[model samples]
Target: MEEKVGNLKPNMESVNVTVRVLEASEARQIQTKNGVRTISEAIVGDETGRVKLTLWGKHAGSIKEGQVVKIENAWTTAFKGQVQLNAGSKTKIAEASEDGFPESSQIPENTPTAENLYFQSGSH
Candidate 1:
């Protein structure tokens, strides 16, 4: 089953969700010992709430505002005390259209109500 947006916290391996993209930032670079990493994100929400899904490399180009997406194998990490989701190595992204997901321009009320997420490895 796909995880809820409100279920995001920490200690996760990966997660899958169908969400609506509200906004996306321009690509930014983060330097690492491996290399300078390309990064971008979309402010996405489901019926539950909103979270930032940071995209790396091609996933950055693949996502955009107003698009409904199905994200699988995306990892989550803690940043500034809050959870930051990312499309890092081995993640998958695809356009989605499902009944329970929100519209492209919708906003989530009440926000995430919280928990540590430990996403299971492997694809379904």
Candidate 2:
């Protein structure tokens, strides 16, 4: 199910939400139990609100400012005391935007808030 950023809570099993990458910080290499990891911290939000997320792999390189993404199976807390819709072990993250896809045609003169530019399209 889809969740709104304003209503995020901890201790839940799977919380699905969609948010945009409002801003991102520089990528940094860090040490973890797993191994060396590259991650970038970001501030992402939607019409509802904004949240923080740790981006690694695709989450790190793919998501960019102004792009909307689908995040799911998320678990957050003092950590979302800390991040966003999805970006971790269990969460499934994917692009929910259409910034670079081929449009059926040029956008209509009437613009609808990047109605197409950030348009969610295709399968993740």
Candidate 3:
């Protein structure tokens, strides 16, 4: 059954769920045990939360950071108490721009409550 990430239970299996790309890393080549070359592993999310997704074959190159994508024939598996999606040869992903999803920034920052005291006085 298709469900949001937040609604996903541990070890819940699903197929064909729409998700948004929360973060993506530069494509890196990885060699499988069989010596096949592939690029994989991207973090995606929905209105609920984020999860790690593994893309196989040609589909890996088609996804981009902050792009909403529709995944078909996908399955869910829990790793370290978190649920993640696995895309296989039968899976498909497409740009979800029409879904009205927003791209989030990929950065670390101080808490919003912390004011910049050094910058306030223009010191150093």
Give stretches of model 1 more than 4 Å off.
Answer: 99-123
lDDT of 3 by residue, 34-110 (tens): 78746667887553456677676667666677677876557667777766666656665656431333322321111
Q: How high is the lDDT of residue 117 in model 2? A: 28
Write model 1 residue lDDT over 56-95, tens digit each, in one string. 8867766677778777766888778776787855887777
How should the candidates be ordered by TM-score, best one leading? 1, 3, 2
- Give TM per candidate: 0.75, 0.61, 0.62
- Please identify model 2 stretches exceeding 4 Å from their true place: 80-86, 97-124
Candidate 3's C-alpha runs over 4 A off are 9-13, 97-124
Clashing pairs in 2: 52-83, 79-82
Please provide, for model 2 over 6-115, each residue's C-alpha lDDT reduced to its tens digit, 9 standing for 90 to 100.
44665567666556666777777789888976677877655245566666654566657656676767665545255343355456887754234332133321122233
Q: How many clashes (backbone N, Cα, C below 3 Å) per candidate?
A: 0, 2, 0
Of the candidates numbered 1 and 3, which has the greater lDDT value? 1
- Give the number of the best model, judged by TM-score: 1
